Design an enzyme around this catalytic site. Structure first.
Site, PDB file in Angstrom:
ATOM      1  N   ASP A  33      -2.178  43.784  45.421  1.00  0.00           N
ATOM      2  CA  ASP A  33      -1.046  44.476  45.652  1.00  0.00           C
ATOM      3  C   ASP A  33      -1.116  46.080  45.377  1.00  0.00           C
ATOM      4  OD1 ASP A  33       1.757  45.392  46.157  1.00  0.00           O
ATOM      5  OD2 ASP A  33       2.159  43.244  46.227  1.00  0.00           O
ATOM      6  N   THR A  34      -1.532  46.821  46.088  1.00  0.00           N
ATOM      7  CA  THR A  34      -1.485  48.437  45.892  1.00  0.00           C
ATOM      8  C   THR A  34      -0.065  49.013  45.698  1.00  0.00           C
ATOM      9  OG1 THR A  34      -1.542  48.870  48.311  1.00  0.00           O
ATOM     10  CG2 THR A  34      -3.671  48.854  47.120  1.00  0.00           C
ATOM     11  N   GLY A  35       0.946  48.340  45.980  1.00  0.00           N
ATOM     12  CA  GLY A  35       2.392  48.717  45.911  1.00  0.00           C
ATOM     13  C   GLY A  35       2.743  48.399  44.540  1.00  0.00           C
TER      14      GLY A  35
HETATM   15  C1  LIG Z   1       7.041  47.089  46.583  1.00  0.00           C
HETATM   16  C2  LIG Z   1       7.285  46.510  45.149  1.00  0.00           C
HETATM   17  C3  LIG Z   1       6.330  45.379  45.256  1.00  0.00           C
HETATM   18  C4  LIG Z   1       6.285  44.894  43.541  1.00  0.00           C
HETATM   19  C5  LIG Z   1       5.561  43.656  43.375  1.00  0.00           C
HETATM   20  C6  LIG Z   1       5.311  43.374  42.163  1.00  0.00           C
HETATM   21  C7  LIG Z   1       5.666  43.874  40.891  1.00  0.00           C
HETATM   22  C8  LIG Z   1       6.602  45.118  41.099  1.00  0.00           C
HETATM   23  N1  LIG Z   1       7.245  46.131  40.265  1.00  0.00           N
HETATM   24  C9  LIG Z   1       6.272  47.134  39.955  1.00  0.00           C
HETATM   25  O1  LIG Z   1       5.490  47.157  39.524  1.00  0.00           O
HETATM   26  C10 LIG Z   1       6.910  48.664  40.754  1.00  0.00           C
HETATM   27  N2  LIG Z   1       8.300  48.631  40.519  1.00  0.00           N
HETATM   28  C11 LIG Z   1       9.123  49.668  41.222  1.00  0.00           C
HETATM   29  O2  LIG Z   1       8.611  50.408  41.867  1.00  0.00           O
HETATM   30  O3  LIG Z   1      10.625  49.388  41.156  1.00  0.00           O
HETATM   31  C12 LIG Z   1      11.380  49.470  42.311  1.00  0.00           C
HETATM   32  C13 LIG Z   1      12.988  49.047  41.769  1.00  0.00           C
HETATM   33  C14 LIG Z   1      11.467  50.814  42.824  1.00  0.00           C
HETATM   34  C15 LIG Z   1      11.063  48.538  43.288  1.00  0.00           C
HETATM   35  C16 LIG Z   1       6.750  45.608  42.458  1.00  0.00           C
HETATM   36  C17 LIG Z   1       6.655  44.196  46.085  1.00  0.00           C
HETATM   37  C18 LIG Z   1       5.391  43.792  46.958  1.00  0.00           C
HETATM   38  O4  LIG Z   1       4.271  44.610  46.855  1.00  0.00           O
HETATM   39  C19 LIG Z   1       5.759  42.658  47.510  1.00  0.00           C
HETATM   40  C20 LIG Z   1       4.629  42.229  48.612  1.00  0.00           C
HETATM   41  C21 LIG Z   1       4.691  41.033  49.184  1.00  0.00           C
HETATM   42  C22 LIG Z   1       5.779  40.254  49.239  1.00  0.00           C
HETATM   43  C23 LIG Z   1       6.963  40.777  48.332  1.00  0.00           C
HETATM   44  C24 LIG Z   1       6.765  41.879  47.489  1.00  0.00           C
HETATM   45  O5  LIG Z   1       7.845  42.208  46.828  1.00  0.00           O
HETATM   46  C25 LIG Z   1       7.670  43.450  46.005  1.00  0.00           C
HETATM   47  O6  LIG Z   1       8.724  43.831  45.207  1.00  0.00           O
END
Ligand SMILES: CC[C@@H](c1cccc(NC(=O)CNC(=O)OC(C)(C)C)c1)c1c(O)c2ccccc2oc1=O
Lengths: 99, 99
Positions: free
Chosen positions: A25-27
């Site tokens: 997951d690059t996100g």
């Molecule tokens: C896009 C977020 C991201 C994620 C995953 C794991 C941990 C975190 N948390 C972080 O490492 C970054 N946290 C962050 O930016 O905080 C917020 C409040 C601004 C969102 C985020 C994320 C997905 O790829 C995702 C991919 C497929 C299905 C559901 C998903 O469901 C998500 O949620």
């Protein structure tokens, strides 16, 4: 493994010897995985996902082997819908995203 | 363009001429964004992420301009804290994970 994104980037990794299927997951800034017993050196942490926040346990310097490279990173265990390997591990693997 | 993952891969995408900042996400299948008007030919759907379920309106075949290319993909709009461009757009751009 070059990853053509036509097929979901799912892989099998070893988190301290126990195999787990994880999503590259690059996100995600962090990595979070459900179901492994890593131990008693933890620290309750919170990770905010796209739909809300979940409580997790943060484990520092854990041995991970994925895509044939061993790395040591922070893994959080929690009640997560899918197991995710975030940027903290992708960068340790030397993984990039190309166009 | 190559994108080391040292920093979150956030780019500016023009969806139907409306500029939004989107996080390039390999883990996601769909792309979700908030704060844009896409018209009235939608389908209500529910996407499950970490933390919870999201209510969205799905628009198929929308003009997207990002990373200097133009694509036609499906975009979901919803009240999400972060705009995400998932695999459906990444495949269309011809992006791949590397190493
Ligand atoms: C896009 C977020 C991201 C994620 C995953 C794991 C941990 C975190 N948390 C972080 O490492 C970054 N946290 C962050 O930016 O905080 C917020 C409040 C601004 C969102 C985020 C994320 C997905 O790829 C995702 C991919 C497929 C299905 C559901 C998903 O469901 C998500 O949620």
């Amino acid at each position: 493994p070059q990853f053509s994104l036509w097929k979901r980037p799912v892989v099998t990794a070893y988190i301290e010897g126990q195999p787990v299927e994880v999503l590259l997951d690059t996100g995600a800034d962090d990595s979070i995985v459900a179901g492994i017993e890593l131990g008693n050196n933890y620290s309750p942490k919170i990770v905010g996902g796209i739909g809300g926040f979940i409580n997790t346990l943060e484990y520092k310097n854990v041995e991970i082997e994925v895509l044939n490279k061993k790395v040591r990173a922070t893994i959080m265990t929690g009640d997560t819908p899918i197991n995710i390997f975030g940027r903290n591990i992708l960068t340790a693997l030397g993984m990039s995203l190309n166009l």
